[PDB]
Amino acid sequence: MLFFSFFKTLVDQEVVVELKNDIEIKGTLQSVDQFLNLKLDNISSTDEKKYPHLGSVRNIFIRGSTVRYVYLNKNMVDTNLLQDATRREVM
Amino acid sequence: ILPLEVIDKTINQKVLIVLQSNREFEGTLVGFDDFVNVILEDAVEWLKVMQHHGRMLLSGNNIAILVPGG
Amino acid sequence: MLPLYLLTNAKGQQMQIELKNGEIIQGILTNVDNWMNLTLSNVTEYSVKLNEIYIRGTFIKFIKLQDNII
Amino acid sequence: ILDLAKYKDSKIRVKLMGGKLVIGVLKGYDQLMNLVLDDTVEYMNARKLGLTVIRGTILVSLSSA
Amino acid sequence: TPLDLLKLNLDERVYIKLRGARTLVGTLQAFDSHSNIVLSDAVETIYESERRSEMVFIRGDTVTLISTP
Amino acid sequence: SVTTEFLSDIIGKTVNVKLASGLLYSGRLESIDGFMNVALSSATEHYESNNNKLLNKFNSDVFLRGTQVMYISEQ
Amino acid sequence: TLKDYLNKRVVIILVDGESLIASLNGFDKNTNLFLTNVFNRISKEFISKAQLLRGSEIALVGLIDAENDDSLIENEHVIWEKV
User: Fold this and answer.
1) What range(s) does the Sm domain occupy (chain B)?
2) Taking the alpha carbons of E31, E36, E38, E44 in that order, is the dihedral positive or negative?
3) Which residue range is the domain that position D52 belongs to?
4) Which of C10, G21, G45, G78 has the most CB atoms at less than 10 Å from its CB?
5) Chains C/D: 3 or more C-beta pairs closer than 8 A?
6) Residue to test with chain C: of D14, D60, D64, most C Cβ within 10 A
7) Is F30 part of the contact surface with chain E (CB cutoff 8 Å)?
């Protein structure tokens, strides 16, 4: 449950999400679940070809399983805390 | 009869192991577990053919069919 | 209501299942478990008639249910 | 939910996760739905494997033939 | 134990091979057993165009290999 | 467990670990777990055969997902 | 999560790149969703009045704006070598 909590710290932030289909959507991190499912509000297209065929849609659910990257801003993370946390792992 | 006995009774005999992907292995069944991770000896991998020497642990995830003899 | 709960309360109802490979199973629901594995009776199978069929949940895309399902 | 008992010594048709059809006579099973099949024919065209054990983990559909 | 040997090179630069002709070198910040990984100062190679981010989260089911460059 | 034994017995030996992709990595096996997760060292990656063109050589420990591994054979 | 969406027409993107239009009337943790009046956009045909769609197939689910309905592997190895 590390990456769960990490993501819960990013609520209300601007994040870009890349899927396996290469789809890329920018938007505000509204919610995350255990499986790492995200719901982004006020969504926008970084790339014209990367964007999908969605009408005037503002709000989406994205399945955890279909994500490749979530892009972040170094400002939005204490990487110190992240490494201490990663150390405290346990299989 | 159980399937998990037939598998066991093929221990130390020629076995065919067909994976879900179009790839199979023939070798002597050395042993297996409850997840069907098979141990094969002198395994002949097909696809297009490779000859293995020794004990191979073949992952039980991709195992689809087991064939005594092959 | 919850998909699983709705599915179980639909026993006896005729329904249409599409599998991952594009295939179409059609018949009446006689059983479901928690992984949405289902057995069906009075089955017809499109790309063939069958008394009963078993489907693994994970191999299902979607399930046309009966319009009168409320 | 499926009583394999009524399929015993009958010719059954099983599709497997991976795009692999298998037709044989059911000779035995268990609750994990691991099957023993004889006079097995597998399809990708076709080849006749002898007596086989099928893994229920990768099992996907099951019917009569 | 494998997971712990990965713990070994945190804050240090690593090389990740992804599914689908993809490659990222970045400094390892955080990972899980699932393999999902966090990199800083990352650079992705697709096959060959480049791509740069300062902070990226990587989803574990796409990761094939991790080593250092 | 036969499978297990064959493991603790090959730790520190040279192994070929083949992945679902067809990629093969040859190296000394540092550790291994319940989920077939492998750590290797001085590993060399080839496609399909050990005798095929070297695709990469790693100077540090190589981490392979267990979900991806198809077999772990010795040599 | 998918509670804001229930009872509201939504646009769904499938993993195979196909698109649907439906009303989200139930969902689980798996993300399989019980939708009503489903219409396939690619085929341009009404699929069903009521269906159960598996979670795995779905990639993304879009809340259609009520006020604006704008709705309507092998060669890989070679590469490594060339490098």
Assistant:
1) 2-70
2) positive
3) 1-65
4) G21
5) yes
6) D60
7) yes
Q: Please give the single-letter amino acid code of residue D5.
A: A
> E27 and E41 in contact (C-beta within 8 Å)?
yes
Q: DSSP 3-state assignment of G49?
A: strand
Domains located in chain C, CATH noted = 1-70 (2.30.30.100)
Beta partners for residue D21, in sequence order:
D15, D43
Determine the length of chain B: 70
Q: Helical H runs in chain F? A: 2-8
D11 in reach of chain B (CB within 8 A): no
> Å from E1 to nearest chain F CA?
6
Strand partners, G50: G36
Distance from CA of B57 to the nearest CA of F (A): 5
Among the partner residues C39, C45, C50, nearest to D2 by beta-carbon distance: C39
Place of tokens 């066991």: B8
Task: Report the number of secondary-structure helices (H) and strands (E) in chain A.
Answer: 2, 5
CATH of the domain spanning G1-83: 2.30.30.100
Nearest CB to E7; choose among A72, A79, A87: A87
Q: Quick check: E30 and A2 CB within 8 A? A: yes
Q: Are E30 and E7 in contact (CB under 8 A)?
A: no
CATH architecture under which domain B1-70 falls:
Roll (2.30)
- Phi/psi of residue D8, nearest 5 degrees: -60, 140
Q: What is the CATH number of domain E1-69?
A: 2.30.30.100
Other C-beta atoms lying within 10 Å of the C-beta of residue D51:
18
Fold of A1-91: SH3 type barrels. (2.30.30)
The nearest CA of chain E is from the CA of F42 a distance in Å of: 11
User: Solved how?
Assistant: X-ray
Task: Assign residue F68 the CATH number of its domain.
Answer: 2.30.30.100
Question: For chain D, how many structural domains are there in total?
Answer: 1
Listed by start position, the domains of chain B span 1-70
Q: To what resolution in angstroms was this structure determined?
A: 3.1
Q: Which position has the token pair 């995830």?
A: B61
Helix (H) or strand (E) holding A11: none
Judge whether A72 and G16 are in contact, CB under 8 Å. Answer: no
d(CA G51, CA G37): 8
Strand partners, E46: E22, E49
Contact A66, A22 (CB under 8 A): no
Q: Are A1 and A17 in contact (CB under 8 A)?
A: no
